[PDB]
Amino acid sequence: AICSALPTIPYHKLADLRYLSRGASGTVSSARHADWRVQVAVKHLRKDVLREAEILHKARFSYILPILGICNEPEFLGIVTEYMPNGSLNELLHRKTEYPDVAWPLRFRILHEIALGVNYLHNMTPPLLHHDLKTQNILLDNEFHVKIADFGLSKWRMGGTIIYMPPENYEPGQKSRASIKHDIYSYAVITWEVLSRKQPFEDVTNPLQIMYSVSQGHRPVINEESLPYDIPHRARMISLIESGWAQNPDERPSFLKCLIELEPVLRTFEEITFLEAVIQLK
Amino acid sequence: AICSALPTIPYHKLADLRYLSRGASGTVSSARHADWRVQVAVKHLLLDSERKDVLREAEILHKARFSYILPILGICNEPEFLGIVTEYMPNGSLNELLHRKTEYPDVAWPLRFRILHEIALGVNYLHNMTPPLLHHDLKTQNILLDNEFHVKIADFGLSKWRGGTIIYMPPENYEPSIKHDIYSYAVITWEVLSRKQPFEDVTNPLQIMYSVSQGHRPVINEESLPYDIPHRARMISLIESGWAQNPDERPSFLKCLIELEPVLRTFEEITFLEAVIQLK
Ligand SMILES: COc1cc2nccc(Nc3[nH]nc(C)c3C)c2cc1S(=O)(=O)C(C)(C)C
Numbered sequence: 001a002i003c004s005a006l007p008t009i010p011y012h013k014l015a016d017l018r019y020l021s022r023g024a025s026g027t028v029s030s031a032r033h034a035d036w037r038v039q040v041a042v043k044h045l046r047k048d049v050l051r052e053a054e055i056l057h058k059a060r061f062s063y064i065l066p067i068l069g070i071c072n073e074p075e076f077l078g079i080v081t082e083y084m085p086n087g088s089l090n091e092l093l094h095r096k097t098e099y100p101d102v103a104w105p106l107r108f109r110i111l112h113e114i115a116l117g118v119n120y121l122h123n124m125t126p127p128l129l130h131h132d133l134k135t136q137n138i139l140l141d142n143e144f145h146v147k148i149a150d151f152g153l154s155k156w157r158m159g160g161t162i163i164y165m166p167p168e169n170y171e172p173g174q175k176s177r178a179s180i181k182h183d184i185y186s187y188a189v190i191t192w193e194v195l196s197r198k199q200p201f202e203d204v205t206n207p208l209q210i211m212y213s214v215s216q217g218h219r220p221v222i223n224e225e226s227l228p229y230d231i232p233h234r235a236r237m238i239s240l241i242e243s244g245w246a247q248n249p250d251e252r253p254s255f256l257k258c259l260i261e262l263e264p265v266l267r268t269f270e271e272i273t274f275l276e277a278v279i280q281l282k
Numbered sequence: 283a284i285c286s287a288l289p290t291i292p293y294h295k296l297a298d299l300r301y302l303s304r305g306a307s308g309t310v311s312s313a314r315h316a317d318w319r320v321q322v323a324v325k326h327l328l329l330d331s332e333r334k335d336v337l338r339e340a341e342i343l344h345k346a347r348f349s350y351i352l353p354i355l356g357i358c359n360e361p362e363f364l365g366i367v368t369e370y371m372p373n374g375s376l377n378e379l380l381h382r383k384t385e386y387p388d389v390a391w392p393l394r395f396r397i398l399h400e401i402a403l404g405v406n407y408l409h410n411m412t413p414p415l416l417h418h419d420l421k422t423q424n425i426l427l428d429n430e431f432h433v434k435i436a437d438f439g440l441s442k443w444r445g446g447t448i449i450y451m452p453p454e455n456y457e458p459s460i461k462h463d464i465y466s467y468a469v470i471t472w473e474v475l476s477r478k479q480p481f482e483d484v485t486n487p488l489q490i491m492y493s494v495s496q497g498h499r500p501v502i503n504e505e506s507l508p509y510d511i512p513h514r515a516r517m518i519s520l521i522e523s524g525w526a527q528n529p530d531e532r533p534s535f536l537k538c539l540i541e542l543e544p545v546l547r548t549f550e551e552i553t554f555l556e557a558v559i560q561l562k
């Protein structure tokens with residue numbers, strides 16, 4: 001029966017408000033809270049903003065973007081969260097000039113924390129299904145620890161890129177929106193993307209042509225060029241990817257199964273290697 | 283009107299339960315959550331008032347959620363067992379970091395200043411709540427350190443909405459205030475910058491209490507606070523105003539933070555990372 005209320009933040013308490021990005025969800029800005037003396041992120045532009053705040057507030061966990069409050073005024077409506085200084089996983093994987101090396105321990109830690117975050121959502125009462133996982137909404141804190149964001153399409157078990165969407169979701173309905181095998185598919189594509197640092201379906205022009213290929217059973221390429229033979233635990237990771245993005249949803253594993261497979265892999269990395277991987281990025 | 287409920291954790295979902303420490307508040311054990319696959323910490327203990335105290339602590343932790351407050355994950359509320367489940371802090375307490383000198387020969391200045399800044403950020407947040415939450419039991423022992431040595435404030439047993447060690451207690455509190463936490467903070471600051479035990483040459487805690495009531499404080503000289511400390515004069519000023527005999531002369535955490543902000547800006551981000559790697 002222990003209940004915590006989300007604080008209401010007056011818009012005038014946000015100082016040094018600076019534009020970060022503009023998306024479908026709305027505009028993201030950075031700011032500093034004048035009383036709390038911390039940096040914050042603000043997602044702004046009704047019911048859909050409040051629904052996302054409610055989900056973030058209820059789904060609080062170590063690998064979920066921490067919500068600090070809501071701006072609910074006639075003048076302004078926005079979601080206030082902790083500021084993620086290292087942006088998104090998408091930026092880390094594809095900004096190769098900015099990041100020439102992303103050490104294996106760190107890539108494996110990121111994959112483990114994404115699975116830990118999604119598993120938590122799935123274990124809630126009732127289960128919370130993300131349904132829009134992408135490298136763009138896997139955010140990175142000051143020490144490159146994962147924070148999952150974007151709960152706009154996230155539904156309680158009661159436009160942009162399609163590369164993380166299972167083929168059965170292309171023509172939606174009751175069954176597809178209800179599916180508990182959607183997030184694992186997205187996770188399988190993210191895993192491939194993290195281990196290769198390549199754009200899934202890079203050689204395909206139209207995203208509609210990607211959709212046609214995926215429905216036939218075609219997936220991002222698994223070979224020596226995309227996934228080199230020097231990748232730690234390559235065979236095990238390939239097995240996880242291929243089961244995760246299987247055409248038949250029934251053949252895709254649960255996040256629990258995924259985590260039990262990843263735990264021995266993560267134990268082979270000494271703690272200092274995670275620290276060294278992060279310093280290499282600065 | 284957005285409300286979040288604290289999850290109830292069945293005791294059987296806590297695997298590898300191992301003793302860590304025993305305190306006045308209760309026993310602390312480490313464990314792993316069988317479904318969530320994460321390491322956790324459990325603070326556990328049979329009386330109506332004793333049960334109510336644990337529920338009070340869990341309520342405070344749940345309501346006072348913030349970046350520098352120990353994150354609560356759930357409550358174990360069973361006939362068989364009653365406990366508070368939180369994130370596991372792998373680096374223990376600030377007390378251990380400052381005084382285990384063989385384990386930690388160097389604690390670089392950027393990290394010491396970052397710790398001091400995060401303690402002030404955490405306490406300021408508590409003070410800014412509606413109504414204000416006053417810690418009233420700040421000590422180096424309940425300043426916990428996460429995997430990257432970021433601060434998490436714990437122990438909300440004595441924390442009130444507006445025993446043990448007396449070294450962090452203002453003299454007016456001996457015979458029973460929004461000016462208690464700043465006093466504790468001033469002692470913690472001295473302790474962080476010196477790595478010495480406050481009043482180390484005293485054989486009885488009553489001798490500390492008598493000294494403090496007479497306006498005497500931990501020594502500030504070249505031996506305790508060397509001349510090579512970054513921003514030494516400013517830090518000494520903060521310490522001395524923070525532990526002033528007259529509570530009215532002690533600053534607010536807002537003032538304290540405005541004082542610390544330019545100090546923290548002089549350190550490049552990579553120096554914090556290098557300070558942590560030096561500890562491993
Ligand atoms: C450094 O760039 C960003 C930092 C962010 N920190 C926290 C949250 C962000 N976005 C967000 N998602 N959902 C909510 C409710 C909020 C505030 C952040 C977003 C960015 S960004 O927009 O520049 C990026 C890296 C995603 C393009």
Ligand SMILES: COc1cc2nccc(Nc3[nH]nc(C)c3C)c2cc1S(=O)(=O)C(C)(C)C
Pocket residue numbers: 302303310323324325352366367368369370371372373374375378423426436437
């Ligand atoms: C590594 O040692 C500890 C880690 C801890 N991690 C999280 C919480 C702890 N204590 C706690 N305080 N309040 C609550 C509700 C809880 C669970 C931790 C305590 C320890 S310890 O007891 O070994 C130490 C370092 C304080 C002596």
